[PDB]
Amino acid sequence: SHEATVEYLADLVKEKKHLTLFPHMFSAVERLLDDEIGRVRVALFQ
Amino acid sequence: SHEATVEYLADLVKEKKHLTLFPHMFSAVERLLDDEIGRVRVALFQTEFPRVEL
After folding, report:
1. Pairwise CA distance, residues A19 & B39, whole Å
2. With an 8 Å Cβ cutoff, are A33 and B29 in contact?
3. Is B19–A26 a contact, with Cβ atoms under 8 angstroms apart?
4. What does each C-alpha distance from B9 to A9, A39, B13 come to in angstroms?
5. Percentages helix, strand, coil for chain A, rounded to the nearest 5?
6. How many domains does chain B have?
7. What post-translational modification information does the record give (chain A)?
8. Which of A2, A15, A29 sits opposite B15 (nearest CB)?
9. CA of B10: which chain A residue's CA is closest?
């Protein structure tokens, strides 16, 4: 999986923002993104 | 990690197709989606063929 860095986190959060403009049109993608954001946040501080 | 089934794989593939409407706009997501598709294909394959590991 991708290296954890604040830059990556920022991309993930920005891409997540954009998709919320289309309610539940990319439901699977949203779960993946949320999972990966959570994973990267934890990695950043450990 | 989501359960591996045919319907899920199907949803993944449809979502990937939709994302092509947005070239170069969601590339972090493209990598994640391709990873999850691969993982799911492998999971369905390992379930048909339990004695094969990849």
Report:
1. 23
2. yes
3. yes
4. 26, 22, 6
5. 70, 0, 30
6. 1
7. Phosphorylated by cdk-2 which may negatively regulate its expression in distal mitotic germline cells.
8. A29
9. A28
SS3 content of chain B, % helix, strand, coil (to 5): 65, 0, 35
Counting Cα atoms < 13 Å in the Cβ hemisphere of B54 gives 12
Tokens representing B17 are 């197709």
Method: X-ray
Domain of A31, CATH number, reads 1.20.5.4010
3 state SS for A7-40: HHHHHHHHHHHHHCCCCCCCHHHHHHHHHHHHHH
What Å resolution does this PDB entry report? 2.3
First to last CA, chain A: 16
